[PDB]
Amino acid sequence: TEPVGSYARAERPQDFEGFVWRLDNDGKEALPRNFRTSADALRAPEKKFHLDAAYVPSREGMDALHISGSSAFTPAQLKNVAAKLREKTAGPIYDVDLRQESHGYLDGIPVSWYGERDWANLGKSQHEALADERHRLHAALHKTVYIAPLGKHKLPEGGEVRRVQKVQTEQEVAEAAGMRYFRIAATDHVWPTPENIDRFLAFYRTLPQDAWLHFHCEAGVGRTTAFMVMTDMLKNPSVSLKDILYRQHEIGGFYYGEFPIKTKDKDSWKTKYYREKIVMIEQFYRYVQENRADGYQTPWSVWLKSHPAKA
């Protein structure tokens, strides 16, 4: 049995092998889905979270946060994102890729290698995960591929088949958009790992004071809000858990505080990861508070080890 913060280690990777090239985006809209900025207005909280619609959260720090989120995108969409952001900042803009799934671009069509629940790379090390990705992205060249969108049973639905003539890496699409690139291989519906967060902490500490971080995952909800929240915590350790949590939800992200977890029969397996996320995000706030003074010297992983959370 796993200790809270590590429930995912109990799953069997061999049971979620990639099987299809998922279409990550149709490139129909000029912008990717769920695009938002810390420079945006708060909106009423969504019902599903049962929050207090009359509580006005604090904005201390938001203006200097220089953070944003979004779903996967097409090469064109990335340029439109980079253009909206160049209107709000002048510093270096970072495309912060949070996907452990192997994704890239086939003929410019953004795709990811999809296994049930999106765990085709479950258990792999970041190095391994990126090794799988270079490899099958190269193997797609000059070959016939079936790429498609998932309907709802999360199984393919239409799509198209073509012979691949161009193959690209997310990093290369970013460099074409004028953005810098940084990858943190995080598994899809779970609390990021100690490895993931240690890696984000080290990169965060070397950032130019004026860097702008653009986070994105597959749909741009869970993993991206998780990192947007830790960057909020990390950079405004002064403001309360409540405000940060209400804050990141009211500009279009997920609510990471406790709420009543409701799932479809198909998704019952998600419940524990929703509860585990609630516990770890408060433990991370606790870590921000107890090392903020110190030199965030001690990495999250060494601290987590001697300050375990409880379920």
Side-chain angles (χ1 to χ4, degrees):
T1 310
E2 294 287 347
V4 153
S6 291
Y7 290 174
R9 327 216 82 186
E11 309 272 3
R12 329 202 293 107
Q14 65 275 20
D15 290 345
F16 306 85
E17 315 274 40
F19 68 86
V20 67
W21 276 121
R22 196 239 274 240
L23 167 68
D24 286 336
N25 193 295
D26 59 33
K28 301 289 193 58
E29 251 81 297
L31 274 328
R33 285 315 81 205
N34 291 307
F35 183 63
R36 49 189 195 282
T37 298
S38 42
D40 298 349
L42 306 173
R43 62 172 181 29
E46 300 175 334
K47 221 223 179 161
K48 74 183 293 198
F49 294 116
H50 292 284
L51 299 183
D52 182 353
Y55 178 81
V56 195
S58 175
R59 292 183 60 89
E60 197 189 338
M62 295 211 84
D63 204 30
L65 233 197
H66 302 325
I67 258 78
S68 66
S70 116
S71 67
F73 37 62
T74 60
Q77 287 168 349
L78 222 215
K79 269 159 77 51
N80 293 323
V81 166
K84 215 173 162 294
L85 305 181
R86 267 276 101 85
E87 280 175 354
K88 303 189 182 315
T89 168
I93 308 171
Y94 290 75
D95 163 18
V96 181
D97 191 351
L98 311 172
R99 309 170 72 187
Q100 176 169 66
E101 54 268 23
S102 293
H103 63 309
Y105 300 80
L106 257 37
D107 288 345
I109 321 231
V111 299
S112 66
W113 184 244
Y114 189 88
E116 286 191 356
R117 273 181 211 192
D118 207 17
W119 289 346
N121 279 332
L122 186 59
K124 300 196 171 74
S125 70
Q126 167 137 345
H127 165 58
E128 287 162 336
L130 304 187
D132 170 276
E133 173 176 280
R134 291 190 112 257
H135 182 265
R136 73 208 312 134
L137 223 29
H138 192 72
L141 183 72
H142 298 322
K143 300 191 181 324
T144 299
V145 300
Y146 163 49
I147 134 285
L150 296 189
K152 274 155 72 187
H153 27 307
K154 286 58 156 273
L155 288 175
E157 197 140 276
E160 69 173 304
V161 358
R162 20 134 39 75
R163 183 169 234 95
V164 163
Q165 290 305 310
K166 198 160 94 136
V167 162
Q168 278 171 295
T169 233
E170 232 254 37
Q171 172 184 53
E172 312 180 316
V173 159
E175 291 162 0
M179 287 158 90
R180 288 182 194 195
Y181 180 77
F182 188 77
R183 186 67 175 276
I184 291 164
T187 310
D188 205 331
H189 322 256
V190 297
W191 173 249
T193 65
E195 296 53 41
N196 288 157
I197 302 177
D198 278 8
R199 180 175 166 85
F200 175 60
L201 250 305
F203 150 92
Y204 176 79
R205 282 226 269 149
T206 70
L207 290 187
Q209 176 199 171
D210 64 351
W212 179 293
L213 280 14
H214 189 272
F215 301 95
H216 75 89
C217 50
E218 93 292 13
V221 180
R223 286 171 279 179
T224 114
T225 309
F227 281 90
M228 288 179 95
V229 167
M230 311 182 117
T231 299
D232 210 328
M233 315 196 149
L234 235 29
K235 210 155 156 192
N236 303 119
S238 263
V239 352
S240 73
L241 211 208
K242 186 178 198 170
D243 289 298
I244 293 195
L245 295 185
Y246 265 70
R247 209 146 101 148
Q248 292 299 337
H249 167 255
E250 300 187 333
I251 67 170
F254 199 67
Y255 176 67
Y256 266 114
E258 1 174 16
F259 76 98
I261 308 185
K262 302 195 198 97
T263 66
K264 301 175 180 172
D265 184 76
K266 289 167 166 187
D267 317 334
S268 337
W269 64 273
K270 292 182 175 173
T271 305
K272 88 264 250 182
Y273 296 108
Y274 275 127
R275 287 197 133 91
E276 165 178 67
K277 287 197 213 153
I278 292 150
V279 177
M280 299 308 290
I281 95 97
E282 195 167 15
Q283 259 316 263
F284 186 76
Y285 182 78
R286 203 152 266 131
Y287 161 93
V288 161
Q289 293 309 142
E290 291 178 25
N291 294 89
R292 138 193 199 184
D294 210 58
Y296 277 148
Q297 308 283 253
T298 312
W300 161 251
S301 74
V302 179
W303 184 88
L304 223 220
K305 210 148 295 119
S306 55
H307 295 82
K310 65 163 204 317

